[PDB]
Write an enzyme that holds these catalytic residues in place. Structure first.
Site, PDB file in Angstrom:
ATOM      1  CG  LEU A   1      -2.062  -1.014   1.200  1.00  0.00           C
ATOM      2  CD1 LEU A   1      -2.943  -0.846   2.423  1.00  0.00           C
ATOM      3  CD2 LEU A   1      -2.880  -0.897  -0.073  1.00  0.00           C
ATOM      4  CG  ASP A   2       1.360   5.500  -1.969  1.00  0.00           C
ATOM      5  OD1 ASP A   2       2.570   5.245  -1.802  1.00  0.00           O
ATOM      6  OD2 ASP A   2       0.954   6.512  -2.579  1.00  0.00           O
ATOM      7  CB  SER A   3       2.216   7.492   2.409  1.00  0.00           C
TER       8      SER A   3
ATOM      9  CD  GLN B   1      -0.690   4.917   7.875  1.00  0.00           C
ATOM     10  OE1 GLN B   1      -0.126   5.935   7.479  1.00  0.00           O
ATOM     11  NE2 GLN B   1      -1.026   4.732   9.145  1.00  0.00           N
TER      12      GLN B   1
END
Ligand SMILES: CCCCCCCCCCCCCCCCCC(=O)OC[C@H](COP(=O)([O-])OCC(O)COP(=O)([O-])OC[C@@H](COC(=O)CCCCCCCCCCCCCCCCC)OC(=O)CCCCCCCCCCCCCCCCC)OC(=O)CCCCCCCCCCCCCCCCC
Ligand SMILES: CCCCCCCCCCCCCCCCC[C@@H](O)O[C@H](CO[C@H](O)CCCCCCCCCCCCCCC)COP(=O)(O)OCC[N+](C)(C)C
Ligand SMILES: CCCCCCCC/C=C\CCCCCCCC(=O)OC[C@H](COP(=O)(O)OCCN)OC(=O)CCCCCCC/C=C\CCCCCCCC
Ligand SMILES: CCCCCCCC/C=C\CCCCCCCC(=O)O[C@H](COC(=O)CCCCCCC/C=C/CCCCCCCC)COP(=O)(O)OCCN
Ligand SMILES: CCCCCCCCCCCC(=O)SCCNC(=O)CCNC(=O)[C@H](O)C(C)(C)COP(=O)(O)O
Lengths: 84, 88, 124, 178, 274, 175, 104, 128, 459, 70, 63
Positions: free
Chosen positions: B42-44, B47
């Site tokens: 996943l990406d920031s 998140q």
């Protein structure tokens, strides 16, 4: 004594975008090459008793039918009683 | 109030329920210890959206400094337990 | 409202000032001048102690309305005839005030026509 | 609140904070869930095509104009959670929070009731009394010369040790004491 | 002076209520607008009419706050209307009581608010007063209808917007009976009191038909315009706020400036010089 | 009530209408007064009768003090402290009595306004006239003396007032 | 003191202060119970101009409405007994000039 | 292109709108590190005193003592008669007094003149 | 009147002969009995006075002040019992002796049929209070406070002595009865102006008048609790009493000689009320509040109307009780925190609820909440000033607003909010402190039922 | 004091028939009252007396003379 | 039983005390309780005097 009945979480696969304005959003989003990742997280707001809505004027006329029936019965009774 | 007291088991179930409805994450592979960045790729931004989803689910707001370092479902469950003071 | 628009946009002199009506004698129209009639006297109107703003030419119907409300107390819908009578008397009084307003306006219009005709005759 | 703060915020932290603020204020603007979902996806896309900017000057001029646009469109009455610093119940239950040392001043007739609780409390006080003498030495040995640099505390590294400065963190009154 | 103060108060407070998001804040601004209307009634030399309006407003505004508090309690101490969704069927008794109270507030004929607000508007129309104050009273009536529409539409008509854990519960005899007593009040007390008190003022028996209907037309126009403007939030388009919206939402900027400029100066001067 | 004199505090004859019901419907007011009487007035009356007979079993009297007339400040020597003292006390007693007279007239006015209802502006002209006269006299006598008032200051004020009156009368007579 | 970080763990949470940090000269003027200087969504000058304009416009319009009052097209009310001379003021020993009203 | 935000004394500049926080320098970073070090030293001292089970009093704060002492007892020894001090003191300590004296003297002179003329209508003015 | 003087004198022998551990009990009990005896002075008559003898006489102005003076001493002993625990028996007896001597001088000052005896006792009171301030005071600024308090008073008071001896040489007597009966107007002359100033300055300095008040925050902050109570409650009223005695020989000069003082008091109440809003010390705030209330009393006395005098008497009594209670509450906080800073000890309603309600009632009486006697005095003075000039209402209303503001600010800062975490020695309130608060506050709400007892001789 | 109602977690909450019948009843009485009052007292909304027209009044009724008598 | 004892101790005793105090103490002094005199209309009779107020002037009764 409180509300301790061991409530269970419903099935997670019931929630579908189908039949909800989330489809309209999804189609408009795919038209520009995008998709929503949280669409099914909000589907519970359109599934159960929340699926059917009431208009503003319909909300204002909440008890108009029974009130109108009672008014008709009362006016008929008064008409019968007075003419004697 | 008349609110049922939340429990650790209950928090875990709701966190996993929220994560399962995230279609970007495969539901058959996600686990309690599954890291967002690596075990799910996943990406920031993903998140931070997950943190928003948990905030809207549990009705309170995790501060940004505390939220930016929550990388596991178990981490989020423990943080929520610490905030609501649930020992069971 | 239209009278307000006429006065504040058109000719102010052609329409009355409500604070100082009437500006013409009551006998200017016709010499009959039937007088207004009072039914309620000084003493019993004072004893009923209606109100100072209620002691107008419709006072007698108010006296009967208060008496009806007093006698038939528990069933407070008993006496509508007297309430309607008082309302109709006040309606007649308001219509009379309207007629006074229209008479003042038409007297002013006729006076203006008279003075302009006199000025034209003098000029000619 | 729990984690210690750093000396500054890096670029990614500011980007994520701006993203959160924008999404929350957008949700405050577009109220309905479907409308919010549509415009949040549009915002994410609008937030995304500049993700791979390499040079930092452009990435600094960017998010600086974005902050100005956010300040212009920030919905001066955003939604706030009830327990948040702006909420309608932010400090509602703060008057019911009584310190634990107040229990020391109870009358013996008051302590006659709840005897088990005070026995457990005495056990806790004994544990604190020994743990303090241990953790002072631990903190003194672990701190860098010249004093601490951040507000970070070390965990207990032995078996019987307890984390330094633990008494006033674990003995919080409660979230809603009553 | 009293008439002008009442007119400006009712208009400003209705305008501020038009765009609030806290339900309690909207009801409080409604209370302030009704107080301004009472002061207007005082200004046209109608004390007994103002007292009657006080009596009716007691009933229906108290019950409106009752319903607001019931909503807040059932939604886990939530007061923002942005997280109030479909409560028309989830809470039927709160819904019906709030609808009855809102219709009483806006002057629905033959309700408790009719017998005071209607006659107040009638007396304002047929008196030698300011034109501006009369216009502001009419606009305030329209805005009252508008913010009642806002509350109902944004709290009872859409899809649910509250957190997923549903704790809705109306079934408490204390709450139900306390609401229903004020419901019976807001339905019948206006009629009972109006026909049970002696006449203490002259009536406006004869009147133009359009002016007799002015309150009804104004209220209906407010209802329709507010509903039409609220239905556009469903549209899938986003636009930035205007200056008028900013002025209305920040309460004419009065709370900001007047709570920062004088107090800062008064406090600073006291420490610095005295 | 023999407790107070009706002449100092006059009261109208209290004309009241007779109950003339027009409908057979029973008004709750009459029943409410009947139950109120039966449940409140009778026990209170019996308790009062017991108290009054207990009082009558032990009767004793108190008297209203009589104060002699003393020469006032107008016949007092310049430095005669004793006569000045007696005149000052007499003047203070007279001042208190005048205050009580003004109070009596004010109570009359208040009672008239409450009693006459909506017609007070016309039916209380007599009381207003009496209060105006009494207040004018009181203001002439005692106003503007200050906190340290005395009989000498009142005498000086009166002397200046009558000097002005004499000058005005002399001007008018010779006008 | 209102615009300090509300999420930081202060030693004095209500005052938002830390032990040993300099207090500031006017702490008692900024205590979250008194004047705050937090930035507003609208500029201070813009808010001042808008509020002053609204208030001044309302004052001007109220004065104008005083110049142009609203009324119905009717004459003054008629009161029978010499404009109710006795019931307003009295003085029954003066025999006022008889004024009478016109019936139409 | 949006209208700009102009800060004021009672409406300051937001942190995200500060040009300083977007001008990044190594000096800025080291200054921030120094500030955090000082703050953490103070926090460490306070928490070392705060968690001590032997302490049964008030943790004396030299900052509060300095604040109160500067507010009260440090004013006069640091005072100097300057044009600003002299002018402000004279104004704020004399002008209001003479202004109120003028106002009250004028009002009372008008009242006394009216009383002497007899045209004031002091009827029912009994209590003073 | 000796039936009160002799027992007070009698207290000194009893204290000295008492057991090392029984001085407080005996002193409190017998002072309470003397206070009970003093209540017989309240039976005044509408005529001249209760002229007991050639030396002493009582009036309806002197009686409430005497009752308050006699009632204060047991409360001062109760408040002083705490912080003198570690003190030697001889020095404790010396402190009680100082209190007894001060009460004796205060009692003999209010009766004082002759003006020179009044002056002698009026300045004799200055010694015991100076000793109390400069001996049993904690801070090092008590010496400066004592010096200021001594020298302001004496500088204001010596010209009064010169004026008094001159007046006796011109009129032949200084007996108040002869002075009142043989009073004559004061001509408009420079010599008469300076005689007025000499007669007025001594009492204006101890109200205190605005501008001449710099000694009061010093003397009140640095004094012990009993010293603060006796300074605020009774020692401030002396000048007030003195004015209502001496202004009988200053007419009609007062008609225009009062303008500077009227303006000074009217602006100074506003200035001091605003000062109270920004204060980092509790005792300083209470002292400045006392200054504001006494400025109102000055205005009342200078207006010279019956309503002014009634309001002034009621305000002096109410302010004495209220300020004594406020100082006692502040000292209860101080004896736990040892700091005397308002912002440090916070959120005390959570820990001491009964102390919180005592604070609430004291603040409410400070707000002048009706129907309390503080409101009665305030309203009478305001009405008299309005009769004097209609523009005064602006200043009085602003003062009322600021008074409510700073009183509720003082309550909220100390009682409300969140408690300070690091202060863990907040012991439960003792029975002695609660009894002290109750004995302060119950007389106020009992006096509100019988106002004529404290409305002065012009009632 | 009431009954036992349990949370649902994303479902419509339980409703007793008592609250439904009570709300419907009170709405019905409100509307019946409105209709009954309108039927029996309709002039309270529309009025009972017609509004006169000033123009309709004849010139003689107001005593108006076209510069003839004077 | 609870309601009856409550009404006895909370309604009957205060009303007894107030009725006694008003009837035998307050009204003992003059003007303490002042009543607005009842309205008089044509056609009513007075209990004390027994006379009859004359009727109205017989206005023309139509509509
Ligand atoms: C005798 C003839 C009788 C017939 C009379 C005529 C018949 C009808 C004619 C119609 C007239 C207007 C009706 C429509 C009302 C406008 C509603 C609207 O469209 O608003 C949206 C629209 C924009 O919406 P948005 O910004 O996108 O909102 C964002 C989202 O919607 C966010 O939305 P949200 O969810 O957050 O909340 C929505 C909320 C938020 O929306 C708002 O922001 C509300 C703000 C506008 C509403 C105010 C309406 C009335 C204003 C009165 C002001 C008095 C004077 C003030 C003086 C100011 C001084 C500077 O809006 C509402 O709830 C509904 C709006 C209210 C409409 C219902 C009631 C109004 C109808 C009655 C009006 C007149 C009839 C009177 C009846 C009796 C006849 C006498 O607002 C405007 O554009 C403003 C339009 C009017 C503003 C007038 C003030 C301008 C002043 C500038 C200076 C002028 C010169 C002064 C000189 C000074 C010299 C110093
Ligand atoms: C600092 C905090 C407060 C401290 C105490 C302040 C109170 C002291 C103020 C004293 C009150 C006034 C003193 C003298 C007033 C007399 C009236 C004068 O002001 O008016 C004019 C007086 O004219 C001039 O003012 C002449 C005097 C000028 C010189 C005097 C100095 C004035 C200001 C000094 C203030 C200093 C205060 C501190 C001193 C230590 C009227 O002129 P005229 O009608 O013809 O003469 C009337 C007087 N007669 C009849 C006796 C002859
Ligand atoms: C005359 C007024 C003189 C000015 C008084 C200044 C008082 C200074 C000390 C007050 C203490 C400071 C204080 O309480 O803080 C200000 C406090 C906090 O603001 P919040 O909005 O609640 O913030 C909460 C969210 N953070 O706000 C206030 O209470 C300030 C109120 C000041 C009002 C002053 C303006 C009044 C002007 C009125 C003029 C119109 C008169 C009415 C006409 C009547 C018709 C005849
Ligand atoms: C808190 C500090 C205040 C200090 C006290 C200041 C008070 C000022 C009052 C003047 C003091 C002395 C007054 C004299 C006492 C009255 C006696 C009297 O009136 O007799 C006068 C005496 O008058 C004087 O001598 C006055 C001269 C003043 C000398 C001292 C000057 C002090 C400063 C004066 C200016 C400031 C005054 C007010 C200051 C207020 C305080 C700040 C004339 O009497 P004869 O001559 O016998 O009869 C007339 C025919 N031959
Ligand atoms: C309704 C209120 C108004 C809304 C206005 C908001 C509009 C803002 C949009 C403007 C455009 C911008 O964001 S300005 C863009 C600023 N410049 C950059 O983002 C360059 C590099 N970005 C990063 O490196 C980040 O860390 C990232 C990779 C994104 C995440 O990292 P993660 O992998 O660790 O999640």
């Amino acid at each position: 004594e409180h509300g301790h009945s061991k409530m269970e979480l419903p099935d997670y696969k019931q929630w579908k975008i189908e039949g909800t304005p989330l489809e309209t959003v999804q189609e408009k989003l795919a038209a520009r090459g995008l998709r929503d990742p949280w669409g099914r997280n909000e589907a519970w707001r359109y599934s159960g008793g929340f699926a059917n809505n009431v208009s503003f004027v319909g909300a204002l006329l909440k008890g108009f039918k029974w009130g109108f029936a009672a008014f008709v019965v009362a006016v008929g009774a008064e008409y019968y009683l007075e003419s004697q | 109030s008349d609110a049922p007291p939340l429990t650790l088991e209950a928090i875990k179930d709701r966190v996993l329920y929220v994560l399962k409805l995230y279609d970007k994450i495969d539901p058959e592979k996600l686990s309690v210890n599954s890291h967002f960045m690596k075990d799910l790729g996943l990406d920031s931004l993903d998140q931070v959206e997950i943190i928003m989803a948990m905030e809207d689910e549990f009705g309170f707001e995790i501060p940004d400094i505390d939220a930016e370092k929550l990388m596991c479902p178990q981490e989020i469950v423990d943080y929520i337990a610490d905030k609501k003071d649930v020992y069971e | 409202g239209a009278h307000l628009a006429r006065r504040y946009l058109g000719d102010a002199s052609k329409e009355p000032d409500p604070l100082r009506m009437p500006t013409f004698p009551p006998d200017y129209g016709f010499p009959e001048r039937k007088e207004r009639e009072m039914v309620a006297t000084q003493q019993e109107m004072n004893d009923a102690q209606l109100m100072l703003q209620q002691r107008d030419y419709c006072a007698h119907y108010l006296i009967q309305l208060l008496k009806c409300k007093r006698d038939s107390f528990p069933n407070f819908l008993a006496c509508k005839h007297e309430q309607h009578d008082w309302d109709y008397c006040e309606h007649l009084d308001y219509v009379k005030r309207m007629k006074e307003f229209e008479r003042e306006r038409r007297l002013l219009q006729r006076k203006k026509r008279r003075e302009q005709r006199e000025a034209e005759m003098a000029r000619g | 609140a729990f984690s210690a703060p750093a000396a500054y915020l890096t670029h990614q932290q500011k980007v994520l904070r701006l993203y959160k603020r924008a999404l929350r204020h957008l949700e405050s603007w577009c109220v309905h869930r479907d409308k919010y979902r549509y415009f949040a996806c549009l915002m994410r896309a609008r937030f995304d095509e500049h993700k791979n900017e390499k040079d930092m000057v452009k990435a600094t001029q960017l998010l600086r104009q974005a902050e100005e646009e956010f300040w212009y469109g920030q919905h001066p009455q955003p939604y706030i959670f009830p327990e948040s610093p702006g909420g309608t119940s932010y400090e509602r239950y703060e008057c019911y929070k009584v310190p634990e040392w107040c229990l020391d001043d109870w009358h013996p007739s008051e302590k006659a009731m709840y005897p088990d609780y005070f026995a457990k409390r005495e056990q806790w006080k004994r544990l604190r009394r020994e743990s303090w003498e241990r953790e002072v030495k631990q903190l003194q040995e672990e701190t860098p010369p010249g004093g601490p640099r951040t507000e970070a505390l070390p965990p207990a590294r032995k078996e019987g040790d307890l984390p330094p400065l633990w008494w006033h963190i674990v003995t919080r009154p409660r979230e809603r004491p009553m | 002076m009293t008439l002008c103060l009442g007119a400006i108060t009712t208009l400003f407070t209705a305008l501020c209520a038009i765009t609030q998001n806290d339900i309690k804040k909207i009801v409080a601004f409604s209370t302030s607008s009704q107080l301004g209307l009472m002061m207007v009634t005082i200004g046209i030399n109608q004390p007994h009419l103002a007292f009657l309006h006080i009596c009716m407003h007691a009933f229906f505004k108290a019950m409106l706050f009752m319903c607001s508090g019931s909503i807040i309690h059932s939604l886990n101490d939530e007061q923002d209307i942005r997280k109030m969704g479909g409560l028309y069927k989830a809470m039927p008794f709160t819904t019906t009581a709030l609808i009855i109270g809102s219709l009483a507030l806006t002057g629905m004929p033959y309700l408790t608010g009719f017998y005071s607000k209607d006659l107040i508007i009638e007396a304002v129309n047929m008196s030698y007063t300011n034109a501006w104050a009369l216009l502001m009273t009419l606009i305030a009536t329209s805005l009252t209808a508008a913010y009642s529409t806002r509350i109902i539409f944004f709290a009872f008509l859409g899809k649910p917007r509250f957190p997923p854990l549903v704790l809705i519960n109306e079934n408490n005899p204390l709450l139900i009976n306390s609401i229903k007593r004020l419901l019976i009040g807001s339905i019948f007390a206006g009629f009972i009191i109006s026909n049970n008190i002696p006449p203490m003022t002259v009536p406006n028996t004869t009147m133009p038909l359009y002016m007799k209907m002015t309150a009804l037309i104004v209220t209906i126009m407010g209802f329709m315009l507010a509903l039409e403007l609220n239905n556009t939030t469903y549209y899938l388009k986003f636009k930035y706020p205007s200056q008028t919206y900013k002025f209305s939402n920040m309460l004419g900027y009065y709370p900001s400036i007047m709570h920062r400029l004088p107090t800062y100066h008064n406090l600073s001067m006291s420490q610095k010089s005295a | 009530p023999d407790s107070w004199d009706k002449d100092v505090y006059p009261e109208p004859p209290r004309r009241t209408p007779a109950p003339a019901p027009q409908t057979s419907l029973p008004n709750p007011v009459t029943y409410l007064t009947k139950i109120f009487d039966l449940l409140v007035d009778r026990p209170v009356t019996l308790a009062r009768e017991f108290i009054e007979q207990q009082h009558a079993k032990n009767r004793y009297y108190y008297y209203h003090r009589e104060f002699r007339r003393v020469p006032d400040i107008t016949e007092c020597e310049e430095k005669d402290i004793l006569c000045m003292f007696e005149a000052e006390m007499q003047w203070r007693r007279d001042y208190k009595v005048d205050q009580e007279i003004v109070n009596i007239i004010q109570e009359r006015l208040k009672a008239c306004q409450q009693r006459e209802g909506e017609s007070y502006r016309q039916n209380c002209a007599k009381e207003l006239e009496q209060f105006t006269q009494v207040s004018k006299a009181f203001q002439d006598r005692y106003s503007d003396l200050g906190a340290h008032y005395s009989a000498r200051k009142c005498l000086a004020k009166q002397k200046q007032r009558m000097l002005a009156e004499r000058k005005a009368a002399k001007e008018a007579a010779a006008a | 003191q209102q615009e300090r970080d509300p999420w930081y763990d202060w030693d004095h949470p209500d005052l938002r202060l830390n032990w040993g940090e300099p207090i500031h000269w006017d702490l008692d003027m900024y205590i979250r119970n008194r004047v705050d200087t937090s930035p507003t969504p609208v500029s201070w000058n813009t808010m001042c101009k808008h509020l002053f304009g609204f208030v001044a416009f309302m004052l001007f319009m109220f004065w104008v409405g005083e110049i142009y009052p609203s009324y119905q097209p009717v004459g003054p009310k008629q009161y029978p007994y010499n404009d109710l001379y006795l019931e307003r003021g009295g003085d029954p020993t003066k025999e006022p000039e008889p004024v009478v009203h016109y019936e139409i | 292109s949006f209208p700009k935000y102009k800060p004021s004394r009672l409406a300051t500049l937001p942190a995200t709108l500060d040009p300083a926080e977007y001008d990044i320098s190594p000096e800025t970073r080291k200054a921030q590190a120094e500030r955090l070090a000082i703050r953490s030293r103070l926090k460490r001292e306070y928490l070392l005193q705060y968690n001590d089970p032997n302490r049964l009093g008030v943790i004396e704060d030299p900052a509060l003592i300095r604040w109160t002492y500067a507010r009260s007892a440090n004013i006069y020894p640091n005072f100097r008669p300057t044009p600003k001090t002299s002018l402000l003191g004279a104004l704020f300590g004399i002008g209001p007094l003479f202004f109120w004296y003028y106002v009250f003297k004028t009002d009372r002179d008008k009242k006394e003149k009216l009383i002497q003329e007899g045209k004031l209508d002091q009827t029912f003015n009994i209590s003073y | 009147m000796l039936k009160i003087i002799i027992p007070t004198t009698m207290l000194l022998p009893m204290t000295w002969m008492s057991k090392h551990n029984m001085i407080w009990i005996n002193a409190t009990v017998h002072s309470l009995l003397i206070s009970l005896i003093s209540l017989s002075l309240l039976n005044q008559l509408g005529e001249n006075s209760l002229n007991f003898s050639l030396t002493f006489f009582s009036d309806s102005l002197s009686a409430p002040l005497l009752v308050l003076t006699t009632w204060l001493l047991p409360l001062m002993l109760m408040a002083s019992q705490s912080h003198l625990s570690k003190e030697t028996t001889t020095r404790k007896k010396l402190y009680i002796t100082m209190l007894i001597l001060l009460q004796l001088f205060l009692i003999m000052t209010f009766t004082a049929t002759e003006l020179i005896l009044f002056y002698i006792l009026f300045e004799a009171t200055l010694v015991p209070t100076l000793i109390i301030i400069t001996r049993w005071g904690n801070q090092t600024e008590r010496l400066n406070a004592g010096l200021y308090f001594l020298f302001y008073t004496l500088a204001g008071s010596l010209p009064l002595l010169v004026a008094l001896v001159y007046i006796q040489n011109t009129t032949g007597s200084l007996n108040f009865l002869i002075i009142h009966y043989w009073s004559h107007p004061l001509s408009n002359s420079w010599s008469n102006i300076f005689m007025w100033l000499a007669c007025i300055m001594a009492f204006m300095v101890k109200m205190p008048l605005y501008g001449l008040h710099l000694w009061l925050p010093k003397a009140h902050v640095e004094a012990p609790i009993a010293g603060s109570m006796v300074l605020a409650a009774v020692l401030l009223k002396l000048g007030g009493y003195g004015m209502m005695r001496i202004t009988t020989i200053l007419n009609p000069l007062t008609n225009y000689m009062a303008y500077p003082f009227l303006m000074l008091s009217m602006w100074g109440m506003i200035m001091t009320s605003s000062i109270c809003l920004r204060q980092t010390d509790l005792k300083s705030l209470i002292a400045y509040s006392s200054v504001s209330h006494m400025a109102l009393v000055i205005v009342a006395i200078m207006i010279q109307t019956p309503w002014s005098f009634m309001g002034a008497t009621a305000l002096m009594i109410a302010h004495g009780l209220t300020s004594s209670m406020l100082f006692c509450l502040a000292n209860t906080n101080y004896e736990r925190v040892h700091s005397r800073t308002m912002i440090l000890a916070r959120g005390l309603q959570t820990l001491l609820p009964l102390m919180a309600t005592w604070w609430l009632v004291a603040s409410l009486t400070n707000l002048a909440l009706p129907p309390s006697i503080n409101l009665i005095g305030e309203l009478f003075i305001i009405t008299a000033s309005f009769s004097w000039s209609n523009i005064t209402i602006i200043l009085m209303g602003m003062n009322m607003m600021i008074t409510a503001l700073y009183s509720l600010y003082m309550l909220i800062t100390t009682q409300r909010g969140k408690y300070t975490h690091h202060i863990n020695n907040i012991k439960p309130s003792f029975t002695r402190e609660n009894a002290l608060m109750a004995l302060h506050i119950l007389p106020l709400l009992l006096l509100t039922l019988n106002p004529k007892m404290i409305l002065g001789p012009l009632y | 004091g009431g009954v036992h109602i349990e949370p649902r977690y994303r479902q419509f909450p339980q409703l007793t028939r008592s609250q439904l019948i009570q709300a419907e009843f009170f709405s019905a009485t409100m509307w019946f009252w409105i209709l009954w009052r309108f039927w029996h007292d309709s002039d309270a909304v529309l009025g009972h007396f017609p509004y006169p027209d000033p123009s309709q009044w004849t010139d003689e009724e107001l005593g108006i003379l076209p510069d003839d008598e004077d | 039983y609870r309601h009856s004892i409550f009404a006895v101790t909370h309604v009957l005793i205060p009303v007894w005390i107030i009725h006694y105090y008003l009837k035998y103490h307050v009204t003992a002094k003059p003007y303490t309780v002042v009543e607005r005199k009842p309205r008089i209309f044509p056609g009513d009779t007075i209990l004390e005097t027994g006379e009859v107020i004359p009727l109205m002037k017989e206005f023309p009764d139509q509509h």
